[PDB]
């Protein structure tokens, strides 16, 4: 269970691929992406968000990876995800794996 994003080299997400999520047979998947992303961009206590940390890392060295982060679906289902991204040749390919 996962989905993919590409970001331009300023950080703006320029597309999302929900293919594998749509192939996965569960409802709720739009809320899920929306929530997972917002979590990904949520500051971390006092440290910057995972999205800010990975974007600075991936631009400096072409790969970055986040720990698990948790987020909550509309019905209060609790999920977690983590993100891996690579700089491709110019854009950032990110994958977001849902540990369920």
């Amino acid at each position: 269970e996962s989905f993919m994003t590409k970001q331009d080299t300023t950080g703006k997400i320029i597309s999302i691929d929900t293919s594998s999520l749509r192939a996965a047979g569960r409802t709720g998947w739009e809320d899920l992406v929306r929530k997972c992303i917002y979590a990904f961009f949520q500051p971390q206590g006092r440290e910057p968000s995972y999205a800010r940390q990975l974007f600075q890392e991936v631009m400096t060295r072409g790969t970055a990876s986040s720990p698990s982060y948790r987020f909550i679906l509309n019905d209060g289902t609790m999920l977690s995800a983590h993100t891996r991204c690579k700089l491709c040749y110019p854009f950032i390919m990110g994958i977001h794996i849902i540990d369920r």
Binding site: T10, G11, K12, I13, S15, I16, T18, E30, V33, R34, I37, Y38, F41, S49, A51, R52, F55
Partner: peptide, 15 residues
């Protein structure tokens, strides 16, 4: 770095 807004995500998911 700037987070996406709910309208931005609506855009992305329509494409």
């Amino acid at each position: 770095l700037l987070p996406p807004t709910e309208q931005d995500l609506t855009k992305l998911l329509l494409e």
